[PDB]
């Protein structure tokens, strides 16, 4: 079975979930409990569900899945007694109905996505609050929403912010890897303009220089501009920089980092990419307004042909240009399972507030990972403990 084969592949490479099953699948700490989940359904998340089931949980899952591609995985989970509501979830009203179906099962613990199950539970499905004991939230958007819910005084259950989004060549390595993958263009020997020289922009500039680019930085803060100069970059106004730029990367946290005049000064073939959080830095609406032709040049690359006859290329529709390997999801899933187990053990002692993941869980998972790698480390002596 293709679904079973997908799961078998990931099962080979999720050592922490395998260790958690070895340690807890006889005790079955979640026997008699239901765990409701909203997650993107694929073999890796399936294995999290399977692991929770080995620990005794009744697992009920909604998959946010706009294609049919992982239906084989859904069907394999259903064969293992796990309840899966994932078909037709391209429609928004069906995703919400599937969330309602998870809540129909009166979950004891929720592994949420974006806070969706939890917010519904507090607003339209309050009857589930009786049985709901705790929520684990791994998404940054979810933790924000549940903190905002706390701040209104409406949160009724403990929430753990699993808070594992924190994750060699610095912060700019991922950005340039994505730019290279999406364009297949050389960075060496090119003029790269970086707008903003905070931690993000500096990383992007340093990596570009390591790839062999000549780097120009734009800034509005004189202190930051001096820093860029002392790192060996050229600083000049954007109006000048766009005239020679092969790449322009916005890292400013600002709006309209390029004007209409700036765009009309770009070289034919210039590549634009945003490394900030929102699509306002490169004014996509301005490109759409002034272009005489818009086309898909490559996957994730949009060409805009301008009134001056030149074409410029925008990566990823102006969104953050920079979906994880099996072992990384194994680590994230281990932290999430331990969060649910912590809530199981301690929820009666916890307030209806958002807690940061207890540091003990980070240390337990790290130790388990070292153990699975065969790595040994040092231990503090008595003299060293007395010193610290």
Residues in 234-263 at the binding interface with ligand ADN, rule: CB under 6 A: 252-254, 257
User: By CB neighbour count within 10 A (0-12 exposed, 13-18 middle, 19+ buried), where does 172 fall?
Assistant: buried
- From ligand ADN, a copy of itself, ligand NAI, none, interface partner of 276 (C-beta below 5 to 8 A by class): ligand NAI
DSSP state of 318: G
Span between the terminal Cα atoms of the chain, in Å: 56
Structure tokens at 271: 């590549």
CA atoms 341, 347, 350, 351: torsion sign: positive
Identify which of 192, 200, 274 has the alpha carbon closest to the alpha carbon of residue 233.
Answer: 192
Task: Tell me which of ligand NAI, Cl ion, ligand ADN, none is bound by residue 382, counting a contact when its beta carbon lies within the kind-specific cut-off of 5 to 8 angstroms.
Answer: none
Q: Is 189 exposed, middle or buried (0-12, 13-18, 19+ CB in 10 A)?
A: exposed
From the list ligand NAI, ligand ADN, a copy of itself, none, which binds 230 (C-beta under 5 to 8 Å, kind-based)?
A: a copy of itself
In order of 121, 254, 316, the CA distances from 265 in angstroms are: 53, 21, 22
Q: Is 185 or 226 the residue whose CB approaches ligand NAI more closely?
A: 226
Contacted by 379, from ligand ADN, ligand NAI, a copy of itself, none: CB < 5 to 8 Å by type = a copy of itself
Find the shortest distance in angstroms from Cβ 90 to ligand NAI.
17
Considering the complex, state which of residue 34 and residue 175 has its C-beta at the smaller distance from ligand NAI: 175
Q: Is 200 annotated as a binding residue?
A: yes
- Consult the annotation and say whether 140 binds a ligand: yes
23-82 binders of ligand NAI (CB under 6 A)? none
| Longest distance between any two alpha carbons in the chain, whole Å | 74
The annotation status of 322 as a binding-site residue, yes or no, is yes
Identify what 349 binds: ligand ADN, ligand NAI, a copy of itself, none; CB under 5 to 8 Å per kind. Answer: none
Pairwise CA distance, residues 252 & 281, whole Å:
7
Task: Give the contacts of 364 (CB within 8 A, at least 6 positions apart).
Answer: 338
Number of residues that bind Cl ion (CB under 5 A): 2
Angle 106-134-46 from CA coordinates, rounded to 5°? 70
CA distance 36 to 102: 6
Cα 130–chain centre separation: 31
142 contacts 115 by C-beta, under 8 angstroms: yes
Judge whether 275 is annotated as a binding position.
yes
**How many H helices and E strands in the chain?**
16, 15
141 has binding-site annotation: yes
> Which residue from 169, 116, 161 is spatially nearest to 138, judged by alpha carbons?
161
Residue 219 marked ligand-binding: yes
By CB under 5 A, what part of segment 110-139 binds Cl ion? none
Q: Looking at residues 190 to 229 of the shown chain, list those that interact with ligand ADN (rule: CB under 6 A).
A: 195-198, 201, 218-221, 224
In angstroms, the CA 266 to CA 32 distance is 64
Closer residue to a copy of itself (CB): 56 or 115? 115
Is 34 within any annotated ligand binding site? Answer: no
Which parts of 300-319 interact with ligand NAI (CB under 6 A)?
A: none
Q: Per the annotation, does 196 bind a ligand? A: yes
- Site size for ligand ADN (CB under 6 A): 16
Mask of contacts with ligand NAI, 144-183, x by CB under 6 A? ---------------------------x------------
Question: Which of positions 167-226 make contact with Cl ion (CB under 5 A)?
Answer: 210, 214
Minimal distance, residue 78 CB to a copy of itself, in Å: 21
- Closest-approach residue to ligand NAI (CB): 198
The residue from 18, 83, 305, 322 that contacts ligand NAI (CB under 6 A) is 322
| Cβ–Cβ under 8 Å, residues 205 and 228 | yes
Q: Contacts with ligand NAI in 362-381 (CB under 6 A)?
A: 378
Rounded CA separation 76/87 (Å) = 14
* DSSP letter, residue 267: P
By the criterion CB under 6 A, which residues form the site for ligand ADN?
195-198, 201, 218-221, 224, 252-254, 257, 378, 384
Footprint of Cl ion on this chain (CB under 5 A)?
Answer: 210, 214
Binding-site residues sit at 113, 138-141, 196-201, 219, 254, 275-277, 322
What residues form the annotated binding site for NAD(+)? 139-141, 196-201, 219, 254, 275-277, 322
């Amino acid at each position: 079975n293709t679904g079973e084969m997908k799961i078998n592949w990931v099962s080979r490479y999720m050592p922490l979930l395998n260790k958690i099953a070895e340690e807890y699948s006889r005790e079955k700490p979640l026997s008699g409990f239901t765990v409701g989940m909203s997650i993107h359904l694929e073999a890796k998340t399936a294995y999290l569900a399977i692991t929770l089931s080995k620990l005794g949980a009744k697992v009920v899952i909604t998959g946010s899945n706009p294609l049919s591609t992982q239906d084989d995985v859904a069907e394999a989970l259903r064969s293992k007694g796990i309840t899966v509501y994932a078909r037709r979830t391209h429609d928004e009203s069906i995703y919400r109905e599937n969330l309602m179906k998870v809540l129909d099962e009166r979950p004891d613990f929720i592994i949420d996505d974006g806070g969706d199950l939890t917010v519904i539970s507090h607003t339209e499905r309050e009857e589930v609050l009786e049985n709901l004991k705790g929520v684990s939230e791994e998404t940054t958007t979810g933790v924000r929403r549940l903190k905002a819910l706390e701040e209104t005084g409406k949160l009724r259950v403990p929430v753990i912010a699993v808070n594992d989004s924190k994750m060699r060549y610095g912060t700019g390595q991922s950005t340039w890897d994505a730019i290279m993958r999406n364009t297949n263009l050389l960075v060496a020997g090119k003029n790269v303009v970086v707008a903003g020289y905070g931690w993000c922009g500096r990383g992007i500039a340093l990596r570009a220089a390591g790839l062999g680019a000549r780097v120009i930085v734009t800034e509005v803060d004189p202190v930051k501009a001096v820093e860029a100069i002392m790192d060996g970059f050229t600083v000049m106004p954007m109006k000048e920089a766009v005239k020679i730029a092969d790449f322009v990367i916005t890292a400013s946290g600002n709006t309209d980092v390029l004007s209409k005049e700036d765009i009309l000064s770009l070289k034919d073939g210039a590549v634009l990419a945003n490394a900030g959080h929102f699509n306002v830095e490169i004014p996509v609406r301005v490109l759409e307004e002034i272009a005489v032709e818009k086309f898909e040049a490559r996957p994730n690359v949009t060409g805009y042909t301008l009134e001056n006859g030149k074409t410029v290329f925008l990566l990823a529709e102006g969104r953050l240009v920079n979906g994880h390997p099996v072992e990384i999801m194994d680590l994230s899933f281990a932290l999430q399972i331990f969060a649910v187990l912590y809530l199981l053990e301690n929820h009666r002692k916890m307030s209806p507030k958002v807690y940061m993941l207890p540091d003990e869980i980070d240390e337990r998972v790290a130790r388990m990972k070292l153990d699975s790698l065969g790595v040994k480390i040092d231990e503090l002596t008595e003299k060293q403990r007395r010193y610290l």
